[PDB]
Amino acid sequence: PPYTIVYFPVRGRCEAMRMLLADQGQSWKEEVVTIDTWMQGLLKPTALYGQLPKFEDGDLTLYQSNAILRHLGRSLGLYGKNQREAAQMDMVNDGVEDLRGKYVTLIYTNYENGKNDYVKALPGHLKPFETLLSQNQGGKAFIVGDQISFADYNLLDLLLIHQVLAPGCLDNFPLLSAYVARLSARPKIKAFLSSPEHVNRPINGNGKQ
Amino acid sequence: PPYTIVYFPVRGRCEAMRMLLADQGQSWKEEVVTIDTWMQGLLKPTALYGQLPKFEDGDLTLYQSNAILRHLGRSLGLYGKNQREAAQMDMVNDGVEDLRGKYVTLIYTNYENGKNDYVKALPGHLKPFETLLSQNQGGKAFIVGDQISFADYNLLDLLLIHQVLAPGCLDNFPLLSAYVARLSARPKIKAFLSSPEHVNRPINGNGKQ
Ligand SMILES: N[C@@H](CCC(=O)N[C@@H](CSCc1ccc([N+](=O)[O-])cc1)C(=O)NCC(=O)O)C(=O)O
Ligand SMILES: N[C@@H](CCC(=O)N[C@@H](CSCc1ccc([N+](=O)[O-])cc1)C(=O)NCC(=O)O)C(=O)O
């Protein structure tokens, strides 16, 4: 530390890492970048891939939301207890990222014409996570092993935004329903999710959610 | 170990991990899955995300190409020397993945109509990697630090397949050109790139490259 998140005034690819920091009792600074400021062209060319989020942890400056999550995982001991768990956590997180990519593409490029096919195809994309939960202490612990990891925060966010997109998408996925309920109920996440910083921030950069 | 790769008969998302294993002096088995076998629908339901590659390292079964690369990185000491390097390697690999994703979309969905725009947009996506190299011992070493990492193999593969897509795309990226040449010249990679199993394998699954 200190921690700084440099991002658009949205939840997007930062709410997972924000929930992570909150739940871990870490404080951080938000450097909010408007599109107006972004369109000025001063910051964009200094970013590695010309994109946000950008994250600072003391002397370490990072880009790529999942690299940031993995760094937080390794540094804060949220990357499982062993080599198997670390690999399985990567496998989970890559799955989360696949579906997030499909979600982002829908929201920003094809919402009106593509939502119906998306929500229709969604249960097939959520089943893997229910399956993962089913094979880990009957879904009563975390996505991998018995301790919270970076992969949990990301999957939790993915499930949260998808409930907004499709209200009852988790009714046919009991383990994922209770999982969302259980992790959201953790005191520090509970507090974060009800905080003005979170509540008064749109999920995405357009209207669409 | 033992190592087993379960995949379709293409280079695709497995050539990087193959070059990794080859370069590290590791042997592995190929379990080639044909469209016919996939269609018969016994293996697909058992795969976590209904997709390949599937990877076995002794008792550990994995899906997700990048999770496999990260696992090989962690277990074979190809994940840098410290926290900073590990995070920067993740930042590089995620960038490689982003571009590979765009590549896959071009190849498999919009090759003819989209190739023109893809190639004109390509230099903007290659520049970050040239910049990284220029800032790491003047491009004389690896993408991050002075030892080969899982990120190098993934980047190397991505660059190679783009040299097929756009013959001269590295002309204006001299450090990447030399980087490709130098890594390709590593005896075990040089050997692997000539080997019939690689040479006889098509880059993609639809016969487009
Ligand atoms: N692979 C990268 C993807 C990063 C990314 O897509 N960043 C978007 C913002 S996240 C999605 C997003 C986009 C826009 C807004 N907004 O409010 O304007 C909010 C969120 C961006 O920087 N766009 C600016 C640009 O490319 O020039 C990662 O995981 O970090
Ligand atoms: N995020 C995953 C992506 C893997 C993936 O996309 N797998 C696909 C493509 S394999 C490479 C491939 C693509 C297309 C053909 N083809 O026939 O044209 C052949 C092989 C797959 O298994 N598809 C089977 C399915 O979904 O049922 C990863 O990184 O491993």
- One DSSP character per residue, B139-195 reads GTS-SSTTS--HHHHHHHHHHHHHHHHSTTTTTT-HHHHHHHHHHHHSHHHHHHHHS
Place of tokens 């990891």: A149
Distance B108 CA to ligand 2 centre (A): 10
| Nearest CA-CA distance, residue B196 and chain A, Å | 31
Q: Which residues contact B94 (CB under 8 A, 6 or more apart)?
A: A64, A66, A67
**Experimental technique used to determine this entry:** X-ray
Q: Which fold has domain A2-78+187-208?
A: Glutaredoxin (3.40.30)
What residue spans define the domains of chain B?
A: 2-78+187-208, 79-186
Cα–Cα distance, B71 to A6 (Å, whole number): 30
In the beta sheet, which residues pair with residue B30?
B5
**For residue A98, which residues of chain B lie inside 8 Å, CB to CB?**
49
Q: Which residue of B has its CA nearest to A70?
A: B87
Q: Do A74 and B87 touch (CB under 8 A)?
A: yes
Alpha carbons within 13 A on the beta-carbon side of B149: 25
A67 contacts in B (CB within 8 Å)?
Answer: 87, 90-91, 93-94
* Cα B154-B113-B16 angle, rounded to 5 deg: 10
Give residues with Cβ within 8 angstroms of B135, minimum separation 6.
none
Query: Nearest CA to B153 among B31, B26, B41, B7?
Result: B26
Whole-number Å distance between alpha carbons of A76 and B3: 31
CA atoms within a 13 Å half-sphere pointing along the CA-CB vector of A182: 13
Task: Give the CATH number of domain B79-186.
Answer: 1.20.1050.10
Do B93 and B66 touch, CB atoms closer than 8 A?
A: yes
Q: Which helix (H) or strand (E) holds A31?
A: strand A28-32
Same fold, A2-78+187-208 and A79-186: no
Residue A11 labelled as part of a binding site: no
Judge contact between B103 and B155, C-beta under 8 A. Answer: no
CA–CA distance from B138 to each of A49, A200, B45, B92, B176 (Å)?
20, 46, 48, 17, 11
Contact between A122 and A166 (Cβ < 8 Å) = yes
Give the three-state DSSP class for A173: coil
The resolution, in angstroms to one decimal, equals 1.8
How far does residue A169's CA lie from ligand 1's centre (Å)? 25
